[PDB]
Amino acid sequence: QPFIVLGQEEYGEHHSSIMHCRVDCSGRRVASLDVDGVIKVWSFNPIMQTKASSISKSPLLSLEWATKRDRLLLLGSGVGTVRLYDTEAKKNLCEININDNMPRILSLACSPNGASFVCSAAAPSLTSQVPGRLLLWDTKTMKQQLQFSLDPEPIAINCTAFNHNGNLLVTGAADGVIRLFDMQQHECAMSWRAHYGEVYSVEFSYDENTVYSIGEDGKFIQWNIHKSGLKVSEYSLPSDATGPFVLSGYSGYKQVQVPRGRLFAFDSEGNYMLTCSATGGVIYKLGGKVLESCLSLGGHRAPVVTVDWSTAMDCGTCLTASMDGKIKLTTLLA
Ligand SMILES: O=C(NC1(c2ccc(Cl)cc2)COC1)c1ccc(N2CC[C@H](O)C2)cc1
């Protein structure tokens, strides 16, 4: 067995379906956001303890931790704004209007060196062909520097990830296209059709010879980063990995969530991958003629919609978040 399960705990302060759940850079704090606009900052080591909590008056759609200033958290709204929140001072340092016509801040990514961040800003959802923009910001001044043109047309970018040094940014969009941006030259280095439907999550492999993606068509694909649109491997995931995630009752009433947060997460070496399931997290060994689960974390009574995996002090922690608002924290030893 690759992992020893040390334990499983539950964080139950959210009373609404989870949108996002991310561990900070220190590997000690979580910022979780639910669909009611409640943002919680909490610790889990040595015990579960809420550090900060707030109800947003306006809609909140994305969150991203700072990479050098651990306590700083970026919050993207649904009213065209980016909030910088100091989790130690329990106060907003600023709120900047990220222009107009595109109020949905769907994605936020902080560059590894701490000098910049990117955000995706999209128009209201009317069709799948809805316009969007990709903005580059300076963290020192909290000012927008530029906007990257998207070809063939403006489109909603759903997910963003930087590579280790921060000179490349991989993005996934609502048109199913993956765009790789050179961050030194500020241009699209590569782009290809990745999915038949929306791209939900993107990540660079640990060796950075590939990029992983998960999309609306239910596929988990590994792409060759040196040869545009060339596949390294491809897998059809179970439907409860990509949703729509549905929570029903006996009332006729049901809640339906399409992926918004991280749909996959990786161990420190990028050899294992954590995914969603109706019952809890499912981990697959990567590089294995189909893909088979090696660890099922369980513990959920409502569909898991977003996951995270962090490693700190040679101890891995898996976050699995569900539609009833429950967040399970599974401790994994190598
Ligand atoms: O906190 C500010 N920057 C730093 C930073 C680091 C990481 C991230 Cl992700 C974002 C920002 C650069 O080191 C801290 C910071 C705070 C307030 C500022 N205002 C307030 C009034 C104006 O809007 C400028 C500017 C800048």
Curated annotation (Swiss-Prot):
WD repeats lie at residues 13-52, 55-95, 122-147, 152-191, 194-233, 256-292, 299-334. Disulfide bonds: none annotated. It comes from Homo sapiens. This is WD repeat-containing protein 91. It comes from the Eukaryota. It is found in: Early endosome membrane; Late endosome membrane. Interacts with WDR81; involved in early to late endosome cargo transport. Interacts with BECN1; negatively regulates the PI3 kinase/PI3K activity associated with endosomal membranes. Belongs to the WD repeat WDR91 family. Functions as a negative regulator of the PI3 kinase/PI3K activity associated with endosomal membranes via BECN1, a core subunit of the PI3K complex. By modifying the phosphatidylinositol 3-phosphate/PtdInsP3 content of endosomal membranes may regulate endosome fusion, recycling, sorting and early to late endosome transport. It is for instance, required for the delivery of cargos like BST2/tetherin from early to late endosome and thereby participates indirectly to their degradation by the lysosome. May play a role in meiosis.
